Amino acid sequence: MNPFHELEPGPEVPEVVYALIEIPKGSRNKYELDKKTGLLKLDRVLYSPFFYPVDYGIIPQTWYDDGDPFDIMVIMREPVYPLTIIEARPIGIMKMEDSGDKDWKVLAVPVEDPYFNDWKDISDVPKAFLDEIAHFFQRYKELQGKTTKIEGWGNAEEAKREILRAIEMYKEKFGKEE
Amino acid sequence: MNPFHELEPGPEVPEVVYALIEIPKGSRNKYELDKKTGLLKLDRVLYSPFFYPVDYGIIPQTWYDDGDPFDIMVIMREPVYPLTIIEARPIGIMKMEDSGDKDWKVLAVPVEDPYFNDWKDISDVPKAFLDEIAHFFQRYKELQGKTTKIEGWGNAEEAKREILRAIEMYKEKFGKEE
Amino acid sequence: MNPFHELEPGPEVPEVVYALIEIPKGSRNKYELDKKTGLLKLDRVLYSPFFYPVDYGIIPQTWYDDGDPFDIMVIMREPVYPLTIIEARPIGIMKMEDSGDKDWKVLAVPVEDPYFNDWKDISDVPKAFLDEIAHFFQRYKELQGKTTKIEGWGNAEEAKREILRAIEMYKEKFGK
Amino acid sequence: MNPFHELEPGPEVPEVVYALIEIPKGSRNKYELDKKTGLLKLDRVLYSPFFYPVDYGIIPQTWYDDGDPFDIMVIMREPVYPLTIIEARPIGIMKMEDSGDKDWKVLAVPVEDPYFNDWKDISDVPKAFLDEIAHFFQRYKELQGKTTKIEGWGNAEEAKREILRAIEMYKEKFGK
Amino acid sequence: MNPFHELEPGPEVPEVVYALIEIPKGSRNKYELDKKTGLLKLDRVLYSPFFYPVDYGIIPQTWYDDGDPFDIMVIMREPVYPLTIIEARPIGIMKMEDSGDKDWKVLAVPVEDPYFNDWKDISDVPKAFLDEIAHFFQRYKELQGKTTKIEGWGNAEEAKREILRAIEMYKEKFGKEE
Amino acid sequence: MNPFHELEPGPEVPEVVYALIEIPKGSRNKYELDKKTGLLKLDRVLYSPFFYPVDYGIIPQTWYDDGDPFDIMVIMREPVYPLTIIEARPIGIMKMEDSGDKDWKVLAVPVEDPYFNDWKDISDVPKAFLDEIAHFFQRYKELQGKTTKIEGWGNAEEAKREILRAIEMYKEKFGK
Ligand SMILES: [Mg+2]
Ligand SMILES: [Mg+2]
Ligand SMILES: [Mg+2]
Ligand SMILES: [Mg+2]
Ligand SMILES: [Mg+2]
Ligand SMILES: [Mg+2]
Ligand SMILES: [Mg+2]
Ligand SMILES: [Mg+2]
Ligand SMILES: [Mg+2]
Ligand SMILES: [Mg+2]
Ligand SMILES: [Mg+2]
Ligand SMILES: [Mg+2]
Ligand SMILES: [Mg+2]
Ligand SMILES: [Mg+2]
Ligand SMILES: [Mg+2]
Ligand SMILES: [Mg+2]
Ligand SMILES: [Mg+2]
Ligand SMILES: [Mg+2]
Ligand SMILES: [Mg+2]
Ligand SMILES: [Mg+2]
Ligand SMILES: [Mg+2]
């Protein structure tokens, strides 16, 4: 019944994916999906007084180079609740290494918030906002002794290539028969 | 595992029903239950800076003329979280057409909040509050080009007739064997 | 000390003005600065479940055709508290009438939030956001039996010429 | 400017009074207006996980048997910010003693929230809500070793006669 | 699919247990897990303007003398959402009778909030905080006519004995085969 | 009335000081008291998704090496509103430089929250909490290109000697 395994990656992949939100914007508690049960679990409380700048979660039925479900960040005006499904349009991708692992993260906007109707690529996002997101990931685990390195941002096309790669990695990981 | 299908319509229908809340009072995000999975899903962000004036959701194992689960609005002092069950006493019904469809909505109070112990019928509700609810539905989809028409309010008896009709429509819709 | 009279209209008028916020984004309570004392006052509770879509207030030492200080709307990500001063860059103006009075409202962004650094004119705002603000003013007083008429949006140059006109109306009214 | 002394008790005393809110509904921090400066001050943090069930404050230019401004409770759907003025219609009065002093508290509704238009007397309030307010005052200082004694609720006519008495106590105390 | 039955009591019982949170700190709504479905349900609205001083919930696969899942209180700086799993370190136990029933409650801290790293026993908690918790339970059902009696606090060792007893009572209650 | 100048530094300096809060815990908006008028002003929005980990403000009638009122951080469970006065017991001091200026900050607890009754010195604070505060100041202005240097934490005795020094700097600056 774990929604990570049960939900499809999206209704029109990779143009529109499902984002399963784990962490609402504004939260200092780092939630994740419990792997066994699919419940929400507290992974940690962030060691610094930082908050997630985006709603944050995973794309169902994906896996990635870092040995986790593929991360997705959805820009929401009003945060959602954990375990909410958002139909999301990928617009770019944050390129980072986290303790040496290729922990990249899709950046997306909600299809059904008209505020974002003309946001289709990484160039549509205010620079200071991209900088704030990157800085969060650069520093949020500094007090835990972790080395993170932000490479930069890729465009919507690159995000979509990576989503398709992650859908394939899930099939290989869990032995899914086409 | 979709709670819309699994939960009973109520413990003492139609005098007391279960309200499965999708949208907490105060939310501009319009959540609904995903039909396939039963997870919470973002349907849309409202196009106007309005908020749901009531906790809003559905009665399990109901269906209605508009091709959806039967809508219920519960008056709560402190909003609940999405996917919370409230034992609710129907006190009236909002009569409206939404794009030509008979989209009526039960108005109810929580059985277990003593604040509302003497609220048993539509006449117990402040007029301005009924007007605020009606006005929300009159205008919340105006920027989406939708025609809605508020007819008025029915009493507790009429709400209860409609609940029993909706319980029957669900059985017919999903081929339930008595 | 009544901040409407004590504060200047801005540090670099009309390119940068001071916005004295009365109503934080997200409020359904309609607060105003009390004319007499300068304290925050509850004017009303909105009759509908609407909330202010922007941080809303006044430009100090202004007056306007509707017999009030000139209104200003500041787009803020995190709302401020009532009676907070924000250095604000006008980027456009909502043209409307309220109960038959000309009641236009400046739209502005905070100078000191870098998110908005490239917002300089009305074309920089998402359409749907302008539509949501206009719709709020179109309908928020409907249950009070009041009529508003929304004309549309003017640009930053219009907004600035209106700010100057409102500064001179304050001198006309209170000056001397 | 100390608003307790500067503001009038009301626009139409005792039918409509001004409530100067100190504590928004939902607070566990007990704020007061500082006697000296008129700024908001933290008096204490309540010793128990209780929150004020009403917007709580004072009527300006009043005094009372307990050596404080006369207390007022305003029922608000959305809480206000501290130091907000609310035009309030008294509808009853909580009769209690606090540490042996007569410390009654007016119960009022906002004139400008139409939700409360038909709330005019103590019989218009749900019983359970009156019970919750009384229980708050019965127990909120228990861990401080303080004794409160709740007598019961008086009606709107009592409340108004007490407001007039408190207005005259302010003149007795500060008058001249 | 009821997580009370599906989740294990903890990853390292009784030193570390899972706390399944029902009620976030700050809530006046008293939520519980629906027994049949595992959904969140509104049990009541508290009759007084009190709020839960701790995140409050249950340890999975436990049962207690009072005929309920064993209660656990987790001290969180930022409240979690209902149905969140917290890995929790027991540090003491609140001893109370509620309408004559032995309704004791584990007090615990999150393993993964470093703020609490040196909280290991009841003596690490500020006295006023223990007093506030006890006073809440002493008075929160006073308007419902219920007699509650707070005995005091036991230490971490006693809390852990009681957790193991509750794990056994669950096996006996639901006929679990070792 | 500008509370920075009007309020005294404390009721029992330096054992108990008045903290005039500018920024509630949890804010990303950086508010300050306006030097001119004493109103709350938005100085900036922090460039990163950081929030103030403490209620943050100033001690009235103090001045400091960095050309500002002396900063104070009050640990509060429930944040206060801006411009609230809190009676605060200093328990330590964050030693840092900001853009090359000595910009130390008192750490204090509220006298009137019994939760903190046994917090009297810097050793009473959880390590991780001191680390989180220091890290906030280490990184919160990084995207503004500003350099801060965190030296470490001093104890209650240091903090109190600094408060006295800051009280005398105010007299040096404004005195007369
Ligand atoms: Mg994750
Ligand atoms: Mg990682
Ligand atoms: Mg990853
Ligand atoms: Mg629905
Ligand atoms: Mg419809
Ligand atoms: Mg319907
Ligand atoms: Mg007008
Ligand atoms: Mg107007
Ligand atoms: Mg006209
Ligand atoms: Mg106007
Ligand atoms: Mg007294
Ligand atoms: Mg008293
Ligand atoms: Mg006496
Ligand atoms: Mg009194
Ligand atoms: Mg329970
Ligand atoms: Mg019990
Ligand atoms: Mg129990
Ligand atoms: Mg400096
Ligand atoms: Mg500095
Ligand atoms: Mg230097
Ligand atoms: Mg400084």
PDB file of N, CA and C and ligand atoms in Angstrom, chain B residues 56 66 68 71 98 101 103 105 140-141, ligand 5:
ATOM      1  N   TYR B  56     -14.326  20.771   4.410  1.00  0.00           N
ATOM      2  CA  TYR B  56     -15.067  20.328   3.236  1.00  0.00           C
ATOM      3  C   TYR B  56     -14.608  18.944   2.827  1.00  0.00           C
ATOM      4  N   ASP B  66     -24.412  14.739  -9.800  1.00  0.00           N
ATOM      5  CA  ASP B  66     -23.349  15.440 -10.507  1.00  0.00           C
ATOM      6  C   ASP B  66     -22.168  14.537 -10.845  1.00  0.00           C
ATOM      7  N   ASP B  68     -20.235  12.710  -8.777  1.00  0.00           N
ATOM      8  CA  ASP B  68     -19.182  12.753  -7.755  1.00  0.00           C
ATOM      9  C   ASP B  68     -19.718  12.179  -6.443  1.00  0.00           C
ATOM     10  N   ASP B  71     -21.087  15.748  -1.442  1.00  0.00           N
ATOM     11  CA  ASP B  71     -20.269  16.815  -0.769  1.00  0.00           C
ATOM     12  C   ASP B  71     -20.881  17.023   0.652  1.00  0.00           C
ATOM     13  N   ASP B  98     -23.889  23.891 -10.596  1.00  0.00           N
ATOM     14  CA  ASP B  98     -22.523  24.210 -10.942  1.00  0.00           C
ATOM     15  C   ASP B  98     -22.315  23.682 -12.348  1.00  0.00           C
ATOM     16  N   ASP B 101     -24.987  21.285 -13.382  1.00  0.00           N
ATOM     17  CA  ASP B 101     -25.119  20.053 -12.607  1.00  0.00           C
ATOM     18  C   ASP B 101     -25.661  20.342 -11.212  1.00  0.00           C
ATOM     19  N   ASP B 103     -25.141  20.216  -8.059  1.00  0.00           N
ATOM     20  CA  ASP B 103     -24.079  20.054  -7.060  1.00  0.00           C
ATOM     21  C   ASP B 103     -24.445  20.510  -5.631  1.00  0.00           C
ATOM     22  N   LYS B 105     -24.864  20.400  -1.441  1.00  0.00           N
ATOM     23  CA  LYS B 105     -23.854  20.153  -0.417  1.00  0.00           C
ATOM     24  C   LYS B 105     -24.459  20.136   0.979  1.00  0.00           C
ATOM     25  N   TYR B 140     -16.303  31.541  -6.386  1.00  0.00           N
ATOM     26  CA  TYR B 140     -14.936  30.986  -6.330  1.00  0.00           C
ATOM     27  C   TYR B 140     -14.382  30.485  -7.657  1.00  0.00           C
ATOM     28  N   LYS B 141     -15.257  30.150  -8.602  1.00  0.00           N
ATOM     29  CA  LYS B 141     -14.828  29.723  -9.939  1.00  0.00           C
ATOM     30  C   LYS B 141     -15.169  30.741 -11.032  1.00  0.00           C
TER      31      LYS B 141
HETATM   32 MG    MG G   5     -19.109  20.956  -8.847  1.00  0.00          MG
END
